[PDB]
Copies of this chain bind each other. A is one copy, B any other.
Amino acid sequence: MIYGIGTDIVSLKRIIRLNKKFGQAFAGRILTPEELLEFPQAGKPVNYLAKRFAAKEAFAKAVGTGIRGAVSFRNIGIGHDALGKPEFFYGPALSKWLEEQGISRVSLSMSDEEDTVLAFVVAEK
């Protein structure tokens, strides 16, 4: 069954405002250590952060708790499978937290057009 569904919209310009405001700190707050390794070489760094920000917020909604406790930005990682499809990877605290509530899997889709970045998330079982 569907445990929950989630969506989030992120403006590129809002990310730009947040970058200026918090400086380095924002990305360091949103991105996981794994994600932070490749961020400096990101061809479109604004899109990179926007994608992660939308996906994690959408994730938090779909799991029904919001960014709280184990469900934290640093625990929710966005990676890609062999064919380039984006997938969630979880920190150990957050990986385990899901089992407890019976959440088996969380699917992700992301898209962008100009200033708008959209994340679509569905949690199963």
Contacts and interface: CB of A to CB of B under 8 A. Distances in A.
A4 to B, nearest CB: 6
Q: Which 5 pairs, one residue from A and one from B, show the smallest C-beta to C-beta distance?
A: A9-B113, A7-B120, A5-B109, A7-B111, A7-B109
A114 B5 contact: no
Q: How many copies altogether?
A: 3
Contacts of A4: 85, 107, 109
Contacts of A10: 113
Interface size class on chain A is 35 or more
A68 B82 CA distance: 13
Contacts of A119: 7
A81 to B, nearest CB: 8
